[PDB]
Amino acid sequence: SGRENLYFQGMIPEHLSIYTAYNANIAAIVKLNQETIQNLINAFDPDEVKRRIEEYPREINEPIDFVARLVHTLKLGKPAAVPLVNEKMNEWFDKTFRYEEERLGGQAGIIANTLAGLKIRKVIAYTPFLPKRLAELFKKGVLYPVVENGELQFKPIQEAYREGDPLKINRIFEFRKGLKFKLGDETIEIPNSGRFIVSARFESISRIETREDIKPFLGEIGKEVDGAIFSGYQGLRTKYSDGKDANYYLRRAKEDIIEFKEKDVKIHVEFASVQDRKLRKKIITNILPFVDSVGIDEAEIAQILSVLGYRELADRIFTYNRLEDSILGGMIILDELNFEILQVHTTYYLMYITHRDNPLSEEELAKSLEFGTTLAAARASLGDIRGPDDYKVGLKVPFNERSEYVKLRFEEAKSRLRMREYKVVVIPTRLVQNPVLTVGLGDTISAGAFLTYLEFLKRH
Amino acid sequence: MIPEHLSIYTAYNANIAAIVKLNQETIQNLINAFDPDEVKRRIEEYPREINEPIDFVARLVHTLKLGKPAAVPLVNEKMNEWFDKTFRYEEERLGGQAGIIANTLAGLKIRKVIAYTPFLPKRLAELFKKGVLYPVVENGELQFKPIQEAYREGDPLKINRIFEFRKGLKFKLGDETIEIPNSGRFIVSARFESISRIETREDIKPFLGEIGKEVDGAIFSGYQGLRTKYSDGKDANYYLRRAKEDIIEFKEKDVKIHVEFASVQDRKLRKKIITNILPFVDSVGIDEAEIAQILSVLGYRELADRIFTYNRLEDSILGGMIILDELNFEILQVHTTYYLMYITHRDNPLSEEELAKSLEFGTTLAAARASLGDIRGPDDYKVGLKVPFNERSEYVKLRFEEAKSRLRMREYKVVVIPTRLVQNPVLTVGLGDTISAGAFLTYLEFLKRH
Numbered sequence: 001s002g003r004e005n006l007y008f009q010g011m012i013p014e015h016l017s018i019y020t021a022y023n024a025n026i027a028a029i030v031k032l033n034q035e036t037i038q039n040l041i042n043a044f045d046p047d048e049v050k051r052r053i054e055e056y057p058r059e060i061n062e063p064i065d066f067v068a069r070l071v072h073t074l075k076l077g078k079p080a081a082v083p084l085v086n087e088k089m090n091e092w093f094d095k096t097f098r099y100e101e102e103r104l105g106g107q108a109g110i111i112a113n114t115l116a117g118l119k120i121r122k123v124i125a126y127t128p129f130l131p132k133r134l135a136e137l138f139k140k141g142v143l144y145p146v147v148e149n150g151e152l153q154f155k156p157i158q159e160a161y162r163e164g165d166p167l168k169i170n171r172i173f174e175f176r177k178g179l180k181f182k183l184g185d186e187t188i189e190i191p192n193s194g195r196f197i198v199s200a201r202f203e204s205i206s207r208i209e210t211r212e213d214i215k216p217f218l219g220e221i222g223k224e225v226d227g228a229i230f231s232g233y234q235g236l237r238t239k240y241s242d243g244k245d246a247n248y249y250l251r252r253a254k255e256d257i258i259e260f261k262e263k264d265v266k267i268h269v270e271f272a273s274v275q276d277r278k279l280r281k282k283i284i285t286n287i288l289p290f291v292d293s294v295g296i297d298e299a300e301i302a303q304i305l306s307v308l309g310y311r312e313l314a315d316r317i318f319t320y321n322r323l324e325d326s327i328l329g330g331m332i333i334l335d336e337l338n339f340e341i342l343q344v345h346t347t348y349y350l351m352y353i354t355h356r357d358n359p360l361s362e363e364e365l366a367k368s369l370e371f372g373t374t375l376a377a378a379r380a381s382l383g384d385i386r387g388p389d390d391y392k393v394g395l396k397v398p399f400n401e402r403s404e405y406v407k408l409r410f411e412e413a414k415s416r417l418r419m420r421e422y423k424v425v426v427i428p429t430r431l432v433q434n435p436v437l438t439v440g441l442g443d444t445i446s447a448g449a450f451l452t453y454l455e456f457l458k459r460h
Numbered sequence: 461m462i463p464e465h466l467s468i469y470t471a472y473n474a475n476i477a478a479i480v481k482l483n484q485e486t487i488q489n490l491i492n493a494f495d496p497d498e499v500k501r502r503i504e505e506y507p508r509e510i511n512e513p514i515d516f517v518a519r520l521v522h523t524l525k526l527g528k529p530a531a532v533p534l535v536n537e538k539m540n541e542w543f544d545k546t547f548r549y550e551e552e553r554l555g556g557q558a559g560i561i562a563n564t565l566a567g568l569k570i571r572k573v574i575a576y577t578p579f580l581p582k583r584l585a586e587l588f589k590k591g592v593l594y595p596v597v598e599n600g601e602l603q604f605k606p607i608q609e610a611y612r613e614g615d616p617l618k619i620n621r622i623f624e625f626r627k628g629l630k631f632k633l634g635d636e637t638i639e640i641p642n643s644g645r646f647i648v649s650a651r652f653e654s655i656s657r658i659e660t661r662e663d664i665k666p667f668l669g670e671i672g673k674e675v676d677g678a679i680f681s682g683y684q685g686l687r688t689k690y691s692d693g694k695d696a697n698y699y700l701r702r703a704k705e706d707i708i709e710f711k712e713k714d715v716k717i718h719v720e721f722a723s724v725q726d727r728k729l730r731k732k733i734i735t736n737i738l739p740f741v742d743s744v745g746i747d748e749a750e751i752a753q754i755l756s757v758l759g760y761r762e763l764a765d766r767i768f769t770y771n772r773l774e775d776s777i778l779g780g781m782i783i784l785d786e787l788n789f790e791i792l793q794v795h796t797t798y799y800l801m802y803i804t805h806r807d808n809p810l811s812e813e814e815l816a817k818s819l820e821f822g823t824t825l826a827a828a829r830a831s832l833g834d835i836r837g838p839d840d841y842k843v844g845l846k847v848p849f850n851e852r853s854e855y856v857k858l859r860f861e862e863a864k865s866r867l868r869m870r871e872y873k874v875v876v877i878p879t880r881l882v883q884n885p886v887l888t889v890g891l892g893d894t895i896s897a898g899a900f901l902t903y904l905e906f907l908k909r910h
C-alpha cells in the first residue's frame with residue numbers, strides 16, 4: 001500500500017480481486033436497410049421462402065429458415081427471437097452481413113468489463129471458449145488464467161485467445177418502420193420498427209465448464225481472489241451428442257465451487273431465466289446451496305419457488321406481484337437452499353435477505369444495495385464504466401418516484417411477516433429516465449452489491 | 461482380500477445403548493417411590509415425552525400392564541443422573557452409525573480409523589474398539605490419539621436405555637396386582653437439546669483439512685439428530701452450513717465422502733438434510749424405506765407410496781435412478797432384506813464386476829457380524845463367506861432382468877446382488893451400517909485400480 005489512502009476521500013472497493021466465469025459472448029447488431037433486405041431476399045426463390053414461412057421453422061438450421069422467419073417478422077412488424085442451432089451458419093451470417101457494431105455480452109464478460117472499468121486491484125475472467133474475436137472485446141485490465149510450463153500465470157485476456165475456439169455470437173437485426181422491399185412480385189412495407197434476434201444455441205458453446213488444462217489450477221486462482229462471480233449455467237443442455245448430460249457438467253461445476261470455497265473465496269451466483277424447467281431445477285439443486293450470495297430478479301423468485309414446491313406462493317407472486325410476497329418468497333428460498341445472502345433486483349426496489357447471524361448491519365446491507373443500483377444508474381447514464389469517478393454520475397440520479405410507496409409497503413410487510421429468522425433490507429432503485437444503455441443492468445447491480453458486500457465482510 | 465491400506469474418518473453420531481433388566485424387585489422398588497394415585501393420573505394424561513421421573517414411571521407401568529413394546533423420548537438431560545442412580549445396567553455397548561462403523565473398521569484392522577463425535581464423555585469413549593483414534597489438538601498441533609483416553613469430563617451423554625420385561629412378572633400398583641401378559645422392551649431414547657448440536661466443534665474445525673490429508677475416505681452420518689429450532693436462536697440451517705463447510709474441506713483434499721442416510725420424520729427437516737448434504741458428497745447408502753422417504757419430499761409421492769407398500773425391485777430401481785438423477789452425487793448404494801444394489805453414472809470408473817464384488821463384500825461382512833455379534837479381526841470375514849446367498853437369489857435375478865426390460869436404463873450402471881442371510885443371527889443391530897462400511901471400503905480400493 002502506498003499509504004496515501006485517505007478515509008475521508010476514498011466507496012468503491014478498490015483493493016478487491018475478483019474472478020468471473022463462465023459466460024462471455026459477442027453481441028452483434030445488423031442494420032437492415034432496403035438494399036440489405038432486398039439483396040438477402042433476392043438470393044432465394046420467393047416461392048421457396050413463402051412455403052418455408054408457412055412451415056414456420058422454430059429454429060434456424062439453414063439460411064432459408066432465417067430468411068423465412070425474418071421476412072415474416074418484417075411483414076408483420078413483430079419482434080421475434082429464433083435460436084441458431086447450427087454452428088456452421090456462423091460463416092454464412094458473417095459473409096452475408098456487415099455488423100454495425102460488435103460488443104461484449106454474457107454475464108461474466110459484462111461484469112468483468114465493469115470491474116476493470118472501476119479499476120479494482122485485479123479482475124480475472126474465465127470462459128472455456130475464447131476465440132480472438134471475443135477476447136478483443138474485453139476491456140483493458142481484464143486478465144485470463146494461463147498455464148506456462150505447469151505454472152499458473154494471469155495474462156491480458158486479449159492475448160490469451162485460441163483460434164479455432166467456438167464462437168458464440170448473438171445477432172440482433174434492427175429494422176425500421178417504413179422500409180419497403182419486394183418478395184417476388186409483392187411490395188412489403190414494414191409497419192413498425194423492431195428487432196429480430198438470432199441467439200447462438202448450438203452444441204459446442206453449451207459445454208460450460210472449466211476446461212481440463214486450467215482445472216488443476218483453480219485452487220491457485222482461489223489464493224489470488226477475494227470473490228468469484230459465477231453464471232452461465234443457463235447455457236447447459238440436458239443431453240449431449242457424446243452421451244454427456246447436464247448432470248455431468250454440474251458435477252464439474254460443484255468441483256469448481258469446492259476449490260474456491262476451501263481457499264476462503266466468497267462465491268456469488270447470478271441466476272438467470274431458465275427456459276427448461278428440468279434444467280432450472282438441476283441448477284437450483286446443484287449450485288445454489290453451495291455458494292454464498294445469489295442474485296435474482298423478481299420473475300425468478302416465482303420460478304425458483306415453483307421448483308421447490310411452493311406452488312401457491314409462486315402463483316400469487318406471478319398473479320399480483322405484491323412486495324410482501326416477494327419478501328416472503330425470498331425468505332423461503334433462503335430457508336430452503338441455505339446459502340448465505342439473497343439479493344433481489346426489481347424495477348423499483350432492491351432487496352437483501354440474510355440469516356439472522358449475518359455479520360453485516362442493516363445499514364451496511366443498505367449501502368451495498370445502494371452501491372449496486374448507483375453503479376447501474378451510472379452505467380445506464382454513460383454506456384460504459386471507464387474509471388471509478390464514473391460512479392459519481394450515478395449519485396446524481398435520484399431514487400425513483402415510488403420510493404416513499406416502496407418504504408411504506410415494506411413497513412406493512414414487516415408487520416405481517418415473521419421477521420425473526422432474517423435480516424431484510426429494501427431500498428428504492430435510482431432509475432435513469434432516458435438511459436443510453438439498458439442491457440445487462442441487473443448484472444451490474446449484482447456485481448456492485450456483491451463487491452461492496454465483500455468489502456464490508458472485511459471489517460467484521 | 462480385506463482392503464487394508466486405507467484410512468477412514470467417520471463422524472458424527474456415537475452413543476451408548478444400555479440394557480436394564482426389569483425384574484420384579486426393580487419394578488416394585490421403582491413404583492414404590494411414587495404415590496400410586498398420582499401414577500394412575502399421569503397414565504390417564506399419557507405424556508408423549510419424558511421430562512420428569514413420573515412421566516417415565518407412568519408410561520412404563522402402562523406398557524407393562526399391556527405387555528406392549530414402546531419407545532418414548534427423554535427430553536430432559538437432567539434426568540440422565542436420575543436413570544443412572546436408579547438402575548443398574550446389564551450391558552452397555554456402543555451405538556450410533558459413526559460409532560458402529562468406527563468399531564467395524566477397527567475390527568478389520570484397516571491402516572487407520574479416526575472417529576469424531578462432538579460429545580465424548582468418558583463412558584462413551586470407553587466403548588470404542590482398540591485402534592479407533594480421535595483428533596486431539598495440543599498447543600496448536602493435531603495428533604490422532606486412542607479415543608478411549610481422549611474424552612472430556614462433563615460432555616453430554618447420549619444414552620438410549622432399553623428396559624427389558626418378561627411375561628409372568630407380577631407387581632403391585634398400590635393394591636392392584638399387575639401381571640405382565642407378554643415379554644417386550646420399553647425404550648427411552650436420548651432426545652434432549654445438547655446432543656442435537658451436530659457439528660465439528662470449533663476446537664477441531666480449523667484442522668479438518670489436516671485430517672483430510674491423512675485419510676482416503678470419510679463416512680458421515682447423524683444429520684437425523686438435528687432439530688428444527690434451538691434455544692439460543694440457532695436452527696437446523698446453522699448446523700447444515702457448518703456441515704457443508706466440513707464436506708468442502710475433505711473434498712478439496714481429494715477424500716471421497718459416503719453419507720449413511722437415516723429416517724427423518726419431519727419432512728421439512730428431511731428435505732433440508734437432502735438439499736444441503738446429498739448433492740455435495742460422493743457415495744450415499746440408504747435402505748428401501750429411505751428411497752421412498754427421499755422421493756416423497758422431492759415430489760414423487762405416488763412412486764414413494766408403491767415402494768412403502770409393495771417393496772418391488774422394479775420401483776426401488778426406478779426410485780434409485782430418480783434420486784441419483786435429481787441429486788447428482790456419484791454413487792447410490794441400497795440395502796434391502798434380499799438384495800443390495802448400486803446405481804451409478806455411465807462414466808463411473810468401476811466395472812459392473814467390481815461394483816458387484818464391492819456389494820458382495822458389504823453383505824458378506826454383515827453376515828459375519830450377524831453370525832458372530834461383532835467384527836473382531838480381519839479373519840472374521842471368512843465366517844460370512846460360509847453363509848450362502850439367500851433362497852430368493854434366482855427370483856431377484858429374474859425380477860432384475862424384467863425391471864431393466866420395462867425401465868429406461870439409459871447408460872446408468874445398475875448392479876443387483878443377493879444378500880447372504882444368516883438363519884439364526886446372534887446380532888441384528890448395525891447390519892445396514894456394516895454393509896455400507898464394507899461396500900464403501902471396497903469401492904475406494906477398486907477406485908485405486910483406475
Ligand SMILES: Nc1ncnc2c1ncn2[C@@H]1O[C@H](COP(=O)(O)O)[C@@H](O)[C@H]1O
Nearest residue numbers: 345346347377380430431432435441442
Ligand atoms: N433506466 C434504468 N436506470 C437504472 N436502473 C435500471 C434501469 N432500467 C433497469 N434498471 C435496473 O436493472 C434491473 C434489471 O433490469 P431489466 O434487465 O430491465 O430486467 C431492474 O430490475 C432495475 O433494477
Ligand SMILES: Nc1ncnc2c1ncn2[C@@H]1O[C@H](COP(=O)(O)O)[C@@H](O)[C@H]1O
Nearest residue numbers: 795796797827830880881882885891892
Ligand atoms: N439375518 C441376516 N443376515 C445377514 N444380513 C442381514 C440379516 N438380516 C438383515 N440383514 C441385512 O441388514 C440390512 C439392515 O436391515 P435391518 O435389519 O432392518 O436394520 C438389511 O437390508 C439386510 O440386507
Ligand code: NA
Nearest residue numbers: 113114384385
Ligand atoms: Na460497464
Ligand code: NA
Nearest residue numbers: 440441442443
Ligand atoms: Na438485466
